[PDB]
Amino acid sequence: QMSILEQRESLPIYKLKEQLVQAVHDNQILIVIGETGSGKTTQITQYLAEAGYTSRGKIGCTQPRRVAAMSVAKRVSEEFGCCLGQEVGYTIRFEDCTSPETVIKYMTDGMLLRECLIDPDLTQYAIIMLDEAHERTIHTDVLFGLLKKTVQKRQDMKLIVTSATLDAVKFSQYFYEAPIFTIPGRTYPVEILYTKEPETDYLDASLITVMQIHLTEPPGDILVFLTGQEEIDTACEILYERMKSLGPDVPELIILPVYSALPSEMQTRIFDPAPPGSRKVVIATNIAETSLTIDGIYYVVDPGFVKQKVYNSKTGIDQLVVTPISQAQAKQRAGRAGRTGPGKCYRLYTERAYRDEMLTTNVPEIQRTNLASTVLSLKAMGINDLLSFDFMDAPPMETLITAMEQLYTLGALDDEGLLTRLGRRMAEFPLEPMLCKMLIMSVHLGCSEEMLTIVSMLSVQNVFYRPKDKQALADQKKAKFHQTEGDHLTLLAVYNSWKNNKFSNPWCYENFIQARSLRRAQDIRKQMLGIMDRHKLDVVSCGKSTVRVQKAICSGFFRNAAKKDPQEGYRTLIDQQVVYIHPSSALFNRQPEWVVYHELVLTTKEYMREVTTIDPRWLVEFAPAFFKVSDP
Ligand SMILES: Nc1ncnc2c1ncn2[C@@H]1O[C@H](COP(=O)(O)OP(=O)(O)O)[C@@H](O)[C@H]1O
Ligand SMILES: [Mg+2]
């Protein structure tokens, strides 16, 4: 098959096209409600560009995730009839696919937030579309407050807020009782199937269900909800092996992973219809709940888990953890099987577990995460009265205080809670405050050439290639890069030996390093170097004096200091928690007295990820505010 125009005119939103453009015309702020797949993200931009709003400025539309922003900009450029990056483009952290021609721009919420820092009145935009607002992320909640302020100054601007939920009433009341525009649409019955007893391994259960659906259920594609990439990559390998084990007579199952770090060629495959006699299985994360819309899906497999940030209010530390979904999310997952016809949802949990063991809705991200980055962004925009900031769902006053005192000990805020030269310099980088700090400190410590590489290597995933077939051999290849001082300097050694071997792809194959990842680090480095140069921050090498690198790391990650326990593992300096060096660490067979880790990862044990050896003396030297027992 059907032409792009026929596909576009088949969408539920098409029936309300003229009435939608008139509503935008008549109202400064409009709340748009419609079920997922009605065409809000992809058509609202196009309708208003056609109405002529692009003559006044850009039409910007936020997306919560990378794959969402890239996919919708690719589709909309095919529908618009242009090059991707020309009239229609996207902006993600470290990838700006826009140009002087761009009139429709899809960007992550974090990217629009970074634009507010530079231009608080968003004068470049005629229309701001806060999309997928029901997902309620820190960046979305921050953008509501910022745009509430913008709408007052910019009388010419148009603000469209979308929702796939009746949480539109809260958004309407928030935005001066703004009108609500409803896109009616057909929702079909979904047969919800629960397990009689819980499952030991939800991964196994998902695979068994997928094969049972594929072999015994009428045609329709399958959507599987998993928690991350490692888990998705594994599920795909086993499913492929298991399907191969059935023999050549068996009908084809097209196994399609979906996650943030996916090559764009892999991203387009998930939207192609299956050939006749074949079936698709899309193995995705919670991106597939609302952000991505795949046609032909009639079956959903739901293990009931999601990876989400949990916060400790006492210690001020947040962490990504695998927890059950809210009841609202279970309904969203099930609904994906009832978009184009009746479907089935296989819940890999009991009816009792749904009814009792599940929260109605989850707590907004702003009330279950560390606010240091948020507070730093707000202080950089001149927003010092944090109590005066109009949040839709206010974080606890204790959290805003915790966030303030952390930036203080970092040296971003002074005694009067105002930004310092450090804080200002830190705010110029799209990185988390502990990463900014160590980059700005490396300028003073004379190792910014090294820190630019380390910050970049830490901003990429999957640096080392470790196939399931060649695991022992991979580990032998990785050990050749192992530095006595730790993981951060091992990451610098990988990049420098790649650079010295003239950025060779065959060198990467030989050494089991992932060339795509080093090429991404090189790109991030080029961009970070650009900021240093604009702000005249000196780029100096430490030569062989790598202790300077260690001091710089410590100056930013002192909160993550740990001491070796004489019996088992390490005890964190902050809450005296038992933490462990992971078997993949350069320090695994040389565990020092004191370390600093990049992040904590919860698997079987609480593991420290990216560990560097420190002198405990540096804690007093680089974080003196962070101490008690200071007088007689
Ligand atoms: N790359 C893509 N990204 C997003 N949607 C796509 C893509 N390719 C095709 N589509 C189609 O676009 C249609 C319209 O969806 P969309 O505008 O995202 O709706 P809504 O925002 O209301 O959920 C969907 O039916 C989907 O299959
Ligand atoms: Mg959408």
UniProtKB/Swiss-Prot annotation:
ATP binds at G34, E35, T36, G37, S38, G39, K40, T41. Expressed in skin, cervix and nerve. Also expressed in the brain. It comes from the Eukaryota. Changing K40E: In GET; inhibition of pre-mRNA splicing and nuclear export of unspliced RNA. A motif (DEAH box) lies at residues 131-134. Keywords: ATP-binding, Helicase, Hydrolase, Isopeptide bond, mRNA processing, mRNA splicing, Nucleotide-binding, Nucleus, Phosphoprotein, Spliceosome, Ubl conjugation. It is found in: Nucleus. GO terms for molecular function: ATP binding; ATP hydrolysis activity; ATP-dependent activity, acting on RNA; identical protein binding; RNA binding; RNA helicase activity. Residues 21-184 form the Helicase ATP-binding domain. It catalyses: ATP + H2O = ADP + phosphate + H(+). One of its GO terms (cellular component) is nucleus. Residues 202-382 form the Helicase C-terminal domain. GO terms for biological process: mRNA splicing, via spliceosome; RNA processing; RNA splicing. The keyword Thylakoid does not apply. Its EC number is 3.6.4.13. Disulfide bonds: none annotated. Its main location: nucleus. Belongs to the DEAD box helicase family. DEAH subfamily. DDX8/PRP22 sub-subfamily. Identified in the spliceosome C complex. Interacts with ARRB2; the interaction is detected in the nucleus upon OR1D2 stimulation. Interacts with SRRM2. Interacts with CACTIN. The RS domain confers a nuclear localization signal, and appears to facilitate the interaction with the spliceosome. Involved in pre-mRNA splicing as component of the spliceosome. Facilitates nuclear export of spliced mRNA by releasing the RNA from the spliceosome. This is ATP-dependent RNA helicase DHX8. It comes from Homo sapiens (Human).
